[PDB]
Amino acid sequence: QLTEEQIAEFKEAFSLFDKDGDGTITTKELGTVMRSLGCNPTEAELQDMINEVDADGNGTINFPEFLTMMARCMKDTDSEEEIREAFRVFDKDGNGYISAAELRHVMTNLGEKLTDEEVDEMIREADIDGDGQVNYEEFVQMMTA
Ligand SMILES: [Ca+2]
Ligand SMILES: [Ca+2]
Ligand SMILES: [Ca+2]
Ligand SMILES: [Ca+2]
Secondary structure (H helix, E strand, C coil): CCCHHHHHHHHHHHHHHCCCCCCEEEHHHHHHHHHHCCCCCCHHHHHHHHHHHCCCCCCEEEHHHHHHHHHHHHHHHHHHHHHHHHHHHHCCCCCCEECHHHHHHHHHHHCCCCCHHHHHHHHHHHCCCCCCCEEHHHHHHHHCC
């Protein structure tokens, strides 16, 4: 869901790219307009968004489709940021790896009470590359999935 204000702003930007007024823009214009609004998807993310929202695959998208993608890109951008912030919290020394000690130092300060063996298990399962710690990627793997 978008607020009244965001929809009006998005409509103004969309109309700027819809010079002919036929109510649609090309998928190329889509990326350009999204970037002007502060959304920076990778080629892959953009294309998957397109194929997923634009079921006809004909190279043009309309205003409501555009709103739906701006909504999705905003949700995704907020999640990612929420996760990064969450990461910086666990990773106390900011060296890019969450150690067992740091996971503990957090469950404690949080209020959660867990036996060290259990603190170690969260790490063990999150730890994918087997270095005994959780890097950023292994972290987002636990958060998203
Ligand atoms: Ca147009
Ligand atoms: Ca279409
Ligand atoms: Ca650390
Ligand atoms: Ca690891």
